[PDB]
Amino acid sequence: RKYFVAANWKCNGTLESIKSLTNSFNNLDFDPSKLDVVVFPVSVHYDHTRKLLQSKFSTGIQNVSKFGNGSYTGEVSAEIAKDLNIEYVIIGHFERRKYFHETDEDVREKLQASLKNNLKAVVCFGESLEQREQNKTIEVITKQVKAFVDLIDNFDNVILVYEPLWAIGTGKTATPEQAQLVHKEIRKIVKDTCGEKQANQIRILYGGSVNTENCSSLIQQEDIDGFLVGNASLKESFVDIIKSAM
Amino acid sequence: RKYFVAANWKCNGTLESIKSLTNSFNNLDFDPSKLDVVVFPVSVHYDHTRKLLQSKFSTGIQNVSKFGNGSYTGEVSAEIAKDLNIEYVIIGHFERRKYFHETDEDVREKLQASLKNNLKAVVCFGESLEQREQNKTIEVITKQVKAFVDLIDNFDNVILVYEPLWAIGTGKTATPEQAQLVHKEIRKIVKDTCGEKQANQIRILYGGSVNTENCSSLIQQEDIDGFLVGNASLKESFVDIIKSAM
Ligand SMILES: O=C[C@H](O)COP(=O)(O)O
Ligand SMILES: O=C[C@H](O)COP(=O)(O)O
């Protein structure tokens, strides 16, 4: 499996900070055939970012609509993304599930619209603290994946991302071993719903707090194939994180 | 007061179609100092559209976040829009209230965020068919305006838009007179909550179905200062609607 390292800049950046960050990133030598490295800037920065990054870097947007083209003010459709050759789209990120009520149904619809339009999707999911304390991790994760995994036609085009909400801003820390346990389980689900061959080829990224100190210990786990980096991807030291997957 | 004509392309467009629609818009000879003409393309189409449109036209985005910069995947903040020199933002469009659960409450926060960053805002509101048949029009409007009127500091920077939901998609039609009566009432509410000078300078656009065959009748009403055109703004004939206002 090819490792995958994605930078989700979320809602950050200015024309000038991006110019400075992209320059640093372009300095890093890596072979895109052996490693996928994707950057996800804010939508209004997509074009600026795509022109500043060397083609070895892939780019994508942080959200796509579940609707097609039409009367949907403020939405960006898969059809529109396709016309711009936008390669990746993030779906189901917890911030959208939390602040903008996105449901498993929405996640499903968006993945369907994305695949139909040849876009590659990075799908997020994970349990919260209350859910982990009740020992419902497995149950929750199973129900979230099964909400969209039948739509996956091609296992190189859909990337899964495990987000340990229970460890996001709650003060509890997730260990590499703990991440690995969940990742192994996720792969099992994919295995017993899509096939053993399919399960071994789909990338499952860890999406908790990743930095230059813990990345090597996370990437080394058997079922962790890369990351979805948050704030650490807003720094020049991001290149160090990429290197841990080389 | 200065008429305002806006094109809300919603979720439509390809690189080619925009490069064809904008060439047609640029042929129109008009003075930007006497009329405000704004085009709102899909966020990922912003740069492309800004580059193709002559400075006569102003540009903006169909939505803006109620949060600032930070961990809000997929959202476009007001400061980010400012750094890009984006001049207008649409807030509270019924499609965002309907399909995405935006409340008057999110409207006020987005308007606060926009003004706080010196962006000009186009705020939308209007009553449904069920609220109209029950004579509830004025009550509903008054509540929607009250949700954010106090935030308006400069009354040339906030543009109000009345969307007659009851006559949108219902199969019902809104006569210019029927529109003028609501606008007059809206302007009275501004007058009684902000002052007479304030109410006389603020623009209130008709945001119902507008085309070439009825634009003249509407702009003539003394309390209707322009429009937020949807579908019709996607046709080259949109220049005729702009003409009706000069
Ligand atoms: O993908 C993104 C994440 O939730 C990251 O979190 P972060 O802001 O701590 O890097
Ligand atoms: O601003 C936009 C509107 O709801 C318009 O409607 P339309 O699609 O009939 O032009």
Side-chain angles (χ1 to χ4, degrees), chain A residues 8 11-12 14-15 43-44 51 62 67 69-71 73-77 83 93 95-96 99-100, chain B residues 8 11-12 14-15 43 51 62 67 69-77 83-84 95-96 99-100:
Chain A
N8 173 13
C11 197
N12 299 288
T14 63
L15 294 177
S43 51
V44 293
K51 294 176 181 180
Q62 297 170 34
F67 312 92
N69 277 166
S71 305
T73 299
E75 297 300 285
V76 181
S77 65
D83 177 72
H93 194 282
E95 267 147 30
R96 295 212 69 75
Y99 306 90
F100 309 91
Chain B
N8 178 15
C11 197
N12 300 94
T14 65
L15 291 176
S43 60
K51 293 175 177 177
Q62 291 166 33
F67 301 116
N69 287 175
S71 308
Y72 306 88
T73 297
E75 289 301 289
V76 171
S77 70
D83 176 69
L84 290 182
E95 287 153 8
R96 296 218 62 78
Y99 297 88
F100 305 90

mmCIF file of all heavy atoms in Angstrom, chain A residues 8 11-12 14-15 43-44 51 62 67 69-71 73-77 83 93 95-96 99-100, chain B residues 8 11-12 14-15 43 51 62 67 69-77 83-84 95-96 99-100:
data_model
loop_
_atom_site.group_PDB
_atom_site.id
_atom_site.type_symbol
_atom_site.label_atom_id
_atom_site.label_comp_id
_atom_site.label_asym_id
_atom_site.label_seq_id
_atom_site.Cartn_x
_atom_site.Cartn_y
_atom_site.Cartn_z
ATOM 1 N N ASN A 8 -4.660 19.177 5.918
ATOM 2 C CA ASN A 8 -5.966 19.831 5.928
ATOM 3 C C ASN A 8 -5.745 21.167 6.631
ATOM 4 O O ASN A 8 -5.650 21.230 7.860
ATOM 5 C CB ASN A 8 -6.998 18.992 6.698
ATOM 6 C CG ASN A 8 -8.334 19.712 6.883
ATOM 7 O OD1 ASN A 8 -8.599 20.740 6.248
ATOM 8 N ND2 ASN A 8 -9.190 19.161 7.744
ATOM 9 N N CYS A 11 -9.804 26.148 8.043
ATOM 10 C CA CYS A 11 -10.087 27.546 7.730
ATOM 11 C C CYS A 11 -8.946 28.468 8.177
ATOM 12 O O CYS A 11 -9.081 29.220 9.151
ATOM 13 C CB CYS A 11 -11.406 27.966 8.396
ATOM 14 S SG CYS A 11 -12.150 29.495 7.742
ATOM 15 N N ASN A 12 -7.830 28.409 7.447
ATOM 16 C CA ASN A 12 -6.644 29.212 7.751
ATOM 17 C C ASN A 12 -5.923 29.660 6.485
ATOM 18 O O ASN A 12 -6.182 29.151 5.394
ATOM 19 C CB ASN A 12 -5.662 28.395 8.590
ATOM 20 C CG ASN A 12 -6.241 27.961 9.916
ATOM 21 O OD1 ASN A 12 -6.414 28.772 10.818
ATOM 22 N ND2 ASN A 12 -6.548 26.671 10.040
ATOM 23 N N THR A 14 -3.577 33.066 4.322
ATOM 24 C CA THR A 14 -3.708 34.358 3.650
ATOM 25 C C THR A 14 -2.892 34.144 2.384
ATOM 26 O O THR A 14 -2.106 33.201 2.314
ATOM 27 C CB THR A 14 -3.072 35.514 4.458
ATOM 28 O OG1 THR A 14 -1.661 35.295 4.581
ATOM 29 C CG2 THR A 14 -3.693 35.607 5.845
ATOM 30 N N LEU A 15 -3.068 34.995 1.382
ATOM 31 C CA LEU A 15 -2.301 34.824 0.156
ATOM 32 C C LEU A 15 -0.811 34.735 0.466
ATOM 33 O O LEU A 15 -0.093 33.917 -0.115
ATOM 34 C CB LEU A 15 -2.548 35.988 -0.804
ATOM 35 C CG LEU A 15 -3.957 36.106 -1.373
ATOM 36 C CD1 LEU A 15 -4.064 37.352 -2.245
ATOM 37 C CD2 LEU A 15 -4.276 34.857 -2.170
ATOM 38 N N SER A 43 -11.471 26.736 -0.112
ATOM 39 C CA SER A 43 -11.938 26.819 -1.492
ATOM 40 C C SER A 43 -11.510 28.046 -2.298
ATOM 41 O O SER A 43 -11.170 27.920 -3.475
ATOM 42 C CB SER A 43 -13.462 26.680 -1.536
ATOM 43 O OG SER A 43 -14.087 27.569 -0.633
ATOM 44 N N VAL A 44 -11.531 29.225 -1.683
ATOM 45 C CA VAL A 44 -11.148 30.443 -2.389
ATOM 46 C C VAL A 44 -9.643 30.534 -2.605
ATOM 47 O O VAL A 44 -9.172 31.417 -3.317
ATOM 48 C CB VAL A 44 -11.619 31.697 -1.631
ATOM 49 C CG1 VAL A 44 -13.143 31.765 -1.648
ATOM 50 C CG2 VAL A 44 -11.106 31.661 -0.207
ATOM 51 N N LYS A 51 -1.460 26.585 -8.197
ATOM 52 C CA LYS A 51 -0.439 27.172 -9.054
ATOM 53 C C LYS A 51 0.917 27.281 -8.355
ATOM 54 O O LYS A 51 1.959 27.245 -9.001
ATOM 55 C CB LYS A 51 -0.886 28.557 -9.524
ATOM 56 C CG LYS A 51 -2.105 28.535 -10.433
ATOM 57 C CD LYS A 51 -2.547 29.948 -10.772
ATOM 58 C CE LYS A 51 -3.784 29.952 -11.651
ATOM 59 N NZ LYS A 51 -4.202 31.346 -11.982
ATOM 60 N N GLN A 62 -11.993 20.839 0.936
ATOM 61 C CA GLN A 62 -12.469 20.377 2.223
ATOM 62 C C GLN A 62 -13.923 19.919 2.329
ATOM 63 O O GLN A 62 -14.327 19.397 3.365
ATOM 64 C CB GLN A 62 -12.175 21.464 3.257
ATOM 65 C CG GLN A 62 -10.678 21.740 3.425
ATOM 66 C CD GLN A 62 -10.395 22.982 4.266
ATOM 67 O OE1 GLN A 62 -11.132 23.301 5.200
ATOM 68 N NE2 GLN A 62 -9.314 23.679 3.943
ATOM 69 N N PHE A 67 -25.583 17.574 -3.349
ATOM 70 C CA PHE A 67 -26.491 17.857 -4.517
ATOM 71 C C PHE A 67 -25.708 18.052 -5.798
ATOM 72 O O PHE A 67 -24.477 18.151 -5.788
ATOM 73 C CB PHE A 67 -27.358 19.080 -4.309
ATOM 74 C CG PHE A 67 -28.063 19.144 -2.979
ATOM 75 C CD1 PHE A 67 -27.472 19.800 -1.913
ATOM 76 C CD2 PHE A 67 -29.303 18.537 -2.795
ATOM 77 C CE1 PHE A 67 -28.096 19.865 -0.680
ATOM 78 C CE2 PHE A 67 -29.944 18.594 -1.558
ATOM 79 C CZ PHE A 67 -29.332 19.254 -0.494
ATOM 80 N N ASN A 69 -25.573 20.177 -9.617
ATOM 81 C CA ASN A 69 -25.616 21.583 -9.979
ATOM 82 C C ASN A 69 -27.048 22.092 -9.809
ATOM 83 O O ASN A 69 -28.000 21.322 -9.911
ATOM 84 C CB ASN A 69 -25.175 21.755 -11.418
ATOM 85 C CG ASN A 69 -23.675 21.795 -11.558
ATOM 86 O OD1 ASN A 69 -23.141 21.677 -12.657
ATOM 87 N ND2 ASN A 69 -22.983 21.983 -10.445
ATOM 88 N N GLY A 70 -27.205 23.386 -9.542
ATOM 89 C CA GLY A 70 -28.545 23.916 -9.371
ATOM 90 C C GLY A 70 -28.703 24.955 -8.285
ATOM 91 O O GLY A 70 -27.736 25.568 -7.843
ATOM 92 N N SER A 71 -29.943 25.142 -7.851
ATOM 93 C CA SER A 71 -30.284 26.123 -6.826
ATOM 94 C C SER A 71 -29.823 25.712 -5.415
ATOM 95 O O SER A 71 -30.639 25.331 -4.597
ATOM 96 C CB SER A 71 -31.772 26.382 -6.850
ATOM 97 O OG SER A 71 -32.179 26.762 -8.146
ATOM 98 N N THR A 73 -27.325 27.696 -3.240
ATOM 99 C CA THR A 73 -26.431 28.775 -2.829
ATOM 100 C C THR A 73 -25.376 28.395 -1.788
ATOM 101 O O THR A 73 -25.691 27.856 -0.735
ATOM 102 C CB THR A 73 -27.235 29.977 -2.289
ATOM 103 O OG1 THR A 73 -28.094 30.473 -3.326
ATOM 104 C CG2 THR A 73 -26.288 31.093 -1.841
ATOM 105 N N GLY A 74 -24.115 28.672 -2.105
ATOM 106 C CA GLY A 74 -23.038 28.376 -1.177
ATOM 107 C C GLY A 74 -22.400 27.006 -1.310
ATOM 108 O O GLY A 74 -21.357 26.752 -0.722
ATOM 109 N N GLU A 75 -23.011 26.121 -2.084
ATOM 110 C CA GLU A 75 -22.469 24.784 -2.260
ATOM 111 C C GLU A 75 -21.561 24.633 -3.466
ATOM 112 O O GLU A 75 -21.679 25.371 -4.445
ATOM 113 C CB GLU A 75 -23.612 23.780 -2.371
ATOM 114 C CG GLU A 75 -24.444 23.732 -1.122
ATOM 115 C CD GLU A 75 -23.615 23.341 0.080
ATOM 116 O OE1 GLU A 75 -23.273 22.146 0.192
ATOM 117 O OE2 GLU A 75 -23.295 24.229 0.899
ATOM 118 N N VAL A 76 -20.647 23.672 -3.380
ATOM 119 C CA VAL A 76 -19.731 23.366 -4.473
ATOM 120 C C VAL A 76 -20.025 21.912 -4.827
ATOM 121 O O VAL A 76 -19.872 21.027 -3.986
ATOM 122 C CB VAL A 76 -18.258 23.499 -4.033
ATOM 123 C CG1 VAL A 76 -17.347 23.197 -5.197
ATOM 124 C CG2 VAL A 76 -17.999 24.899 -3.501
ATOM 125 N N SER A 77 -20.444 21.668 -6.064
ATOM 126 C CA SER A 77 -20.796 20.319 -6.505
ATOM 127 C C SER A 77 -19.647 19.509 -7.087
ATOM 128 O O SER A 77 -18.664 20.062 -7.577
ATOM 129 C CB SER A 77 -21.889 20.396 -7.554
ATOM 130 O OG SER A 77 -21.373 21.054 -8.691
ATOM 131 N N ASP A 83 -14.844 19.511 -13.274
ATOM 132 C CA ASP A 83 -14.489 20.431 -14.347
ATOM 133 C C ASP A 83 -13.192 21.192 -14.070
ATOM 134 O O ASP A 83 -12.532 21.649 -15.000
ATOM 135 C CB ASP A 83 -15.638 21.416 -14.593
ATOM 136 C CG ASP A 83 -15.308 22.446 -15.657
ATOM 137 O OD1 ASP A 83 -15.257 22.085 -16.851
ATOM 138 O OD2 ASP A 83 -15.095 23.621 -15.293
ATOM 139 N N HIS A 93 -15.782 15.018 7.733
ATOM 140 C CA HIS A 93 -14.884 15.504 8.773
ATOM 141 C C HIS A 93 -15.737 15.847 9.999
ATOM 142 O O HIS A 93 -16.813 16.427 9.870
ATOM 143 C CB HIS A 93 -14.115 16.720 8.299
ATOM 144 C CG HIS A 93 -12.950 17.059 9.171
ATOM 145 N ND1 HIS A 93 -13.095 17.701 10.387
ATOM 146 C CD2 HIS A 93 -11.634 16.784 9.043
ATOM 147 C CE1 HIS A 93 -11.914 17.801 10.964
ATOM 148 N NE2 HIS A 93 -11.009 17.252 10.174
ATOM 149 N N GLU A 95 -15.679 18.114 12.235
ATOM 150 C CA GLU A 95 -16.048 19.513 12.403
ATOM 151 C C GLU A 95 -17.345 19.822 11.640
ATOM 152 O O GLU A 95 -18.149 20.654 12.072
ATOM 153 C CB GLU A 95 -14.913 20.409 11.911
ATOM 154 C CG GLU A 95 -13.940 20.821 12.998
ATOM 155 C CD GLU A 95 -12.514 20.966 12.499
ATOM 156 O OE1 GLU A 95 -12.313 21.317 11.313
ATOM 157 O OE2 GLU A 95 -11.591 20.739 13.308
ATOM 158 N N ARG A 96 -17.547 19.154 10.504
ATOM 159 C CA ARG A 96 -18.759 19.362 9.726
ATOM 160 C C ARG A 96 -19.909 18.571 10.341
ATOM 161 O O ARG A 96 -21.066 18.988 10.265
ATOM 162 C CB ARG A 96 -18.542 18.962 8.265
ATOM 163 C CG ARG A 96 -17.523 19.851 7.559
ATOM 164 C CD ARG A 96 -17.849 20.014 6.089
ATOM 165 N NE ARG A 96 -19.064 20.799 5.885
ATOM 166 C CZ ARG A 96 -19.146 22.117 6.035
ATOM 167 N NH1 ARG A 96 -18.085 22.838 6.392
ATOM 168 N NH2 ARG A 96 -20.304 22.719 5.821
ATOM 169 N N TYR A 99 -20.411 20.999 13.924
ATOM 170 C CA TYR A 99 -21.004 22.332 13.745
ATOM 171 C C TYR A 99 -22.074 22.410 12.657
ATOM 172 O O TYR A 99 -22.990 23.172 12.824
ATOM 173 C CB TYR A 99 -19.940 23.400 13.467
ATOM 174 C CG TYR A 99 -18.827 23.477 14.488
ATOM 175 C CD1 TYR A 99 -17.676 22.725 14.326
ATOM 176 C CD2 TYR A 99 -18.938 24.275 15.632
ATOM 177 C CE1 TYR A 99 -16.654 22.752 15.271
ATOM 178 C CE2 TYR A 99 -17.919 24.307 16.585
ATOM 179 C CZ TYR A 99 -16.781 23.541 16.396
ATOM 180 O OH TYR A 99 -15.775 23.575 17.326
ATOM 181 N N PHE A 100 -21.973 21.642 11.591
ATOM 182 C CA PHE A 100 -22.991 21.811 10.550
ATOM 183 C C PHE A 100 -23.930 20.680 10.236
ATOM 184 O O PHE A 100 -24.518 20.608 9.083
ATOM 185 C CB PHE A 100 -22.302 22.270 9.237
ATOM 186 C CG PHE A 100 -21.400 23.466 9.466
ATOM 187 C CD1 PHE A 100 -20.056 23.285 9.777
ATOM 188 C CD2 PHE A 100 -21.891 24.764 9.373
ATOM 189 C CE1 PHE A 100 -19.214 24.372 9.944
ATOM 190 C CE2 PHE A 100 -21.056 25.855 9.541
ATOM 191 C CZ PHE A 100 -19.713 25.662 9.818
ATOM 192 N N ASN B 8 -26.811 35.852 -8.682
ATOM 193 C CA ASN B 8 -26.471 34.754 -7.794
ATOM 194 C C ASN B 8 -26.481 33.530 -8.690
ATOM 195 O O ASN B 8 -27.538 32.983 -9.005
ATOM 196 C CB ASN B 8 -27.498 34.623 -6.656
ATOM 197 C CG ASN B 8 -27.199 33.446 -5.712
ATOM 198 O OD1 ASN B 8 -26.103 32.883 -5.723
ATOM 199 N ND2 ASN B 8 -28.180 33.085 -4.886
ATOM 200 N N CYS B 11 -25.061 27.313 -7.525
ATOM 201 C CA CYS B 11 -24.138 26.222 -7.809
ATOM 202 C C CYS B 11 -24.191 25.858 -9.291
ATOM 203 O O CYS B 11 -24.684 24.795 -9.664
ATOM 204 C CB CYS B 11 -24.502 25.007 -6.949
ATOM 205 S SG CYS B 11 -23.208 23.769 -6.818
ATOM 206 N N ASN B 12 -23.685 26.752 -10.131
ATOM 207 C CA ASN B 12 -23.678 26.529 -11.572
ATOM 208 C C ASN B 12 -22.441 27.096 -12.244
ATOM 209 O O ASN B 12 -21.844 28.055 -11.756
ATOM 210 C CB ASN B 12 -24.901 27.177 -12.232
ATOM 211 C CG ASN B 12 -26.208 26.623 -11.714
ATOM 212 O OD1 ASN B 12 -26.812 27.178 -10.791
ATOM 213 N ND2 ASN B 12 -26.650 25.518 -12.297
ATOM 214 N N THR B 14 -19.121 26.271 -15.494
ATOM 215 C CA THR B 14 -17.954 25.512 -15.895
ATOM 216 C C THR B 14 -16.997 26.625 -16.253
ATOM 217 O O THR B 14 -17.413 27.780 -16.332
ATOM 218 C CB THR B 14 -18.212 24.657 -17.145
ATOM 219 O OG1 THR B 14 -18.458 25.511 -18.267
ATOM 220 C CG2 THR B 14 -19.405 23.747 -16.926
ATOM 221 N N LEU B 15 -15.725 26.301 -16.452
ATOM 222 C CA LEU B 15 -14.766 27.329 -16.822
ATOM 223 C C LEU B 15 -15.196 27.983 -18.140
ATOM 224 O O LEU B 15 -15.153 29.205 -18.276
ATOM 225 C CB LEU B 15 -13.367 26.723 -16.962
ATOM 226 C CG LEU B 15 -12.733 26.260 -15.643
ATOM 227 C CD1 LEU B 15 -11.396 25.578 -15.914
ATOM 228 C CD2 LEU B 15 -12.550 27.456 -14.712
ATOM 229 N N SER B 43 -17.629 29.624 -4.945
ATOM 230 C CA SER B 43 -16.329 29.940 -4.366
ATOM 231 C C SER B 43 -15.113 29.497 -5.196
ATOM 232 O O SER B 43 -14.208 30.302 -5.413
ATOM 233 C CB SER B 43 -16.227 29.381 -2.938
ATOM 234 O OG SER B 43 -16.383 27.975 -2.912
ATOM 235 N N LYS B 51 -11.010 37.611 -12.555
ATOM 236 C CA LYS B 51 -10.087 37.924 -13.637
ATOM 237 C C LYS B 51 -10.810 38.220 -14.956
ATOM 238 O O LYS B 51 -10.375 39.072 -15.715
ATOM 239 C CB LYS B 51 -9.088 36.773 -13.840
ATOM 240 C CG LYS B 51 -8.112 36.575 -12.679
ATOM 241 C CD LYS B 51 -7.210 35.346 -12.870
ATOM 242 C CE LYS B 51 -6.200 35.227 -11.725
ATOM 243 N NZ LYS B 51 -5.338 34.011 -11.815
ATOM 244 N N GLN B 62 -21.165 33.540 -2.165
ATOM 245 C CA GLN B 62 -22.509 33.135 -1.777
ATOM 246 C C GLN B 62 -22.736 32.783 -0.311
ATOM 247 O O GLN B 62 -23.871 32.557 0.102
ATOM 248 C CB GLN B 62 -22.942 31.963 -2.657
ATOM 249 C CG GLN B 62 -23.166 32.344 -4.108
ATOM 250 C CD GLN B 62 -23.250 31.141 -5.015
ATOM 251 O OE1 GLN B 62 -23.734 30.088 -4.614
ATOM 252 N NE2 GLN B 62 -22.792 31.294 -6.253
ATOM 253 N N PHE B 67 -17.896 31.694 12.039
ATOM 254 C CA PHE B 67 -16.713 31.554 12.877
ATOM 255 C C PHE B 67 -15.578 32.330 12.220
ATOM 256 O O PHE B 67 -15.699 32.769 11.079
ATOM 257 C CB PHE B 67 -16.298 30.084 12.984
ATOM 258 C CG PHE B 67 -17.357 29.184 13.568
ATOM 259 C CD1 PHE B 67 -17.914 28.163 12.802
ATOM 260 C CD2 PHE B 67 -17.759 29.321 14.895
ATOM 261 C CE1 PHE B 67 -18.848 27.291 13.344
ATOM 262 C CE2 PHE B 67 -18.697 28.452 15.445
ATOM 263 C CZ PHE B 67 -19.240 27.435 14.670
ATOM 264 N N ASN B 69 -11.111 32.471 11.755
ATOM 265 C CA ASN B 69 -10.127 31.490 11.324
ATOM 266 C C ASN B 69 -10.039 30.436 12.416
ATOM 267 O O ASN B 69 -10.341 30.712 13.581
ATOM 268 C CB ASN B 69 -8.756 32.140 11.134
ATOM 269 C CG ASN B 69 -8.685 33.000 9.892
ATOM 270 O OD1 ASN B 69 -7.682 33.668 9.645
ATOM 271 N ND2 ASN B 69 -9.744 32.984 9.100
ATOM 272 N N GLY B 70 -9.635 29.230 12.041
ATOM 273 C CA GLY B 70 -9.520 28.176 13.028
ATOM 274 C C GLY B 70 -9.838 26.792 12.501
ATOM 275 O O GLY B 70 -9.714 26.524 11.313
ATOM 276 N N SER B 71 -10.277 25.912 13.387
ATOM 277 C CA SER B 71 -10.577 24.533 13.014
ATOM 278 C C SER B 71 -12.033 24.329 12.589
ATOM 279 O O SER B 71 -12.823 23.732 13.322
ATOM 280 C CB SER B 71 -10.235 23.632 14.189
ATOM 281 O OG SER B 71 -8.912 23.911 14.604
ATOM 282 N N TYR B 72 -12.357 24.808 11.395
ATOM 283 C CA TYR B 72 -13.694 24.752 10.855
ATOM 284 C C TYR B 72 -13.619 24.269 9.421
ATOM 285 O O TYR B 72 -13.895 25.018 8.479
ATOM 286 C CB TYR B 72 -14.286 26.151 10.910
ATOM 287 C CG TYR B 72 -14.222 26.762 12.294
ATOM 288 C CD1 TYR B 72 -13.104 27.483 12.737
ATOM 289 C CD2 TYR B 72 -15.282 26.603 13.170
ATOM 290 C CE1 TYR B 72 -13.072 28.032 14.023
ATOM 291 C CE2 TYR B 72 -15.256 27.144 14.451
ATOM 292 C CZ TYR B 72 -14.154 27.859 14.874
ATOM 293 O OH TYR B 72 -14.137 28.402 16.138
ATOM 294 N N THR B 73 -13.293 22.989 9.267
ATOM 295 C CA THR B 73 -13.153 22.392 7.955
ATOM 296 C C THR B 73 -14.267 22.718 6.956
ATOM 297 O O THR B 73 -15.445 22.508 7.226
ATOM 298 C CB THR B 73 -13.009 20.859 8.100
ATOM 299 O OG1 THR B 73 -11.804 20.579 8.822
ATOM 300 C CG2 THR B 73 -12.946 20.177 6.731
ATOM 301 N N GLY B 74 -13.876 23.247 5.804
ATOM 302 C CA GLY B 74 -14.833 23.553 4.757
ATOM 303 C C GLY B 74 -15.492 24.911 4.815
ATOM 304 O O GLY B 74 -16.289 25.246 3.944
ATOM 305 N N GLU B 75 -15.172 25.698 5.832
ATOM 306 C CA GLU B 75 -15.758 27.022 5.957
ATOM 307 C C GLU B 75 -14.841 28.120 5.454
ATOM 308 O O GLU B 75 -13.617 27.999 5.514
ATOM 309 C CB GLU B 75 -16.121 27.295 7.409
ATOM 310 C CG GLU B 75 -17.303 26.489 7.873
ATOM 311 C CD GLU B 75 -18.555 26.764 7.053
ATOM 312 O OE1 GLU B 75 -19.123 27.865 7.184
ATOM 313 O OE2 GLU B 75 -18.976 25.881 6.277
ATOM 314 N N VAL B 76 -15.447 29.185 4.938
ATOM 315 C CA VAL B 76 -14.696 30.338 4.447
ATOM 316 C C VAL B 76 -14.976 31.485 5.417
ATOM 317 O O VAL B 76 -16.114 31.951 5.523
ATOM 318 C CB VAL B 76 -15.148 30.752 3.021
ATOM 319 C CG1 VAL B 76 -14.515 32.072 2.641
ATOM 320 C CG2 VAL B 76 -14.754 29.690 2.016
ATOM 321 N N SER B 77 -13.944 31.934 6.125
ATOM 322 C CA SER B 77 -14.102 33.009 7.098
ATOM 323 C C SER B 77 -14.143 34.405 6.484
ATOM 324 O O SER B 77 -13.725 34.615 5.344
ATOM 325 C CB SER B 77 -12.971 32.957 8.117
ATOM 326 O OG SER B 77 -11.753 33.339 7.505
ATOM 327 N N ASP B 83 -8.867 39.332 3.109
ATOM 328 C CA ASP B 83 -7.495 39.229 2.610
ATOM 329 C C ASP B 83 -7.502 39.064 1.092
ATOM 330 O O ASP B 83 -6.574 39.483 0.417
ATOM 331 C CB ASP B 83 -6.767 38.046 3.270
ATOM 332 C CG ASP B 83 -5.358 37.824 2.708
ATOM 333 O OD1 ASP B 83 -4.466 38.666 2.951
ATOM 334 O OD2 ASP B 83 -5.135 36.809 2.015
ATOM 335 N N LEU B 84 -8.556 38.457 0.556
ATOM 336 C CA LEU B 84 -8.666 38.257 -0.892
ATOM 337 C C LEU B 84 -9.303 39.430 -1.615
ATOM 338 O O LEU B 84 -9.482 39.378 -2.831
ATOM 339 C CB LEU B 84 -9.490 37.015 -1.210
ATOM 340 C CG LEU B 84 -8.893 35.651 -0.900
ATOM 341 C CD1 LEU B 84 -9.871 34.579 -1.334
ATOM 342 C CD2 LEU B 84 -7.589 35.487 -1.639
ATOM 343 N N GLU B 95 -32.068 28.982 0.607
ATOM 344 C CA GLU B 95 -31.576 27.646 0.301
ATOM 345 C C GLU B 95 -30.623 27.191 1.406
ATOM 346 O O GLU B 95 -30.509 25.999 1.686
ATOM 347 C CB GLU B 95 -30.879 27.632 -1.066
ATOM 348 C CG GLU B 95 -31.877 27.722 -2.220
ATOM 349 C CD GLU B 95 -31.300 28.339 -3.491
ATOM 350 O OE1 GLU B 95 -30.074 28.578 -3.564
ATOM 351 O OE2 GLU B 95 -32.088 28.586 -4.423
ATOM 352 N N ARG B 96 -29.950 28.145 2.039
ATOM 353 C CA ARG B 96 -29.033 27.813 3.119
ATOM 354 C C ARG B 96 -29.818 27.632 4.417
ATOM 355 O O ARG B 96 -29.408 26.879 5.309
ATOM 356 C CB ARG B 96 -27.962 28.895 3.273
ATOM 357 C CG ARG B 96 -27.055 29.016 2.055
ATOM 358 C CD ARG B 96 -25.623 29.302 2.468
ATOM 359 N NE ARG B 96 -25.074 28.220 3.283
ATOM 360 C CZ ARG B 96 -24.635 27.055 2.810
ATOM 361 N NH1 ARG B 96 -24.664 26.793 1.512
ATOM 362 N NH2 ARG B 96 -24.164 26.144 3.645
ATOM 363 N N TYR B 99 -32.002 23.917 3.089
ATOM 364 C CA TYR B 99 -31.161 22.735 2.983
ATOM 365 C C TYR B 99 -30.064 22.645 4.075
ATOM 366 O O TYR B 99 -29.622 21.544 4.396
ATOM 367 C CB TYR B 99 -30.493 22.679 1.593
ATOM 368 C CG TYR B 99 -31.455 22.557 0.430
ATOM 369 C CD1 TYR B 99 -32.008 23.683 -0.169
ATOM 370 C CD2 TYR B 99 -31.832 21.310 -0.048
ATOM 371 C CE1 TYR B 99 -32.918 23.567 -1.217
ATOM 372 C CE2 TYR B 99 -32.739 21.184 -1.096
ATOM 373 C CZ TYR B 99 -33.281 22.320 -1.676
ATOM 374 O OH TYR B 99 -34.177 22.219 -2.711
ATOM 375 N N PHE B 100 -29.625 23.742 4.691
ATOM 376 C CA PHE B 100 -28.523 23.572 5.662
ATOM 377 C C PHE B 100 -28.616 23.966 7.123
ATOM 378 O O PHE B 100 -27.590 24.026 7.829
ATOM 379 C CB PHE B 100 -27.243 24.178 5.089
ATOM 380 C CG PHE B 100 -26.876 23.630 3.760
ATOM 381 C CD1 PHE B 100 -27.337 24.234 2.602
ATOM 382 C CD2 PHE B 100 -26.158 22.454 3.671
ATOM 383 C CE1 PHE B 100 -27.064 23.684 1.367
ATOM 384 C CE2 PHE B 100 -25.880 21.893 2.441
ATOM 385 C CZ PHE B 100 -26.340 22.502 1.286
#
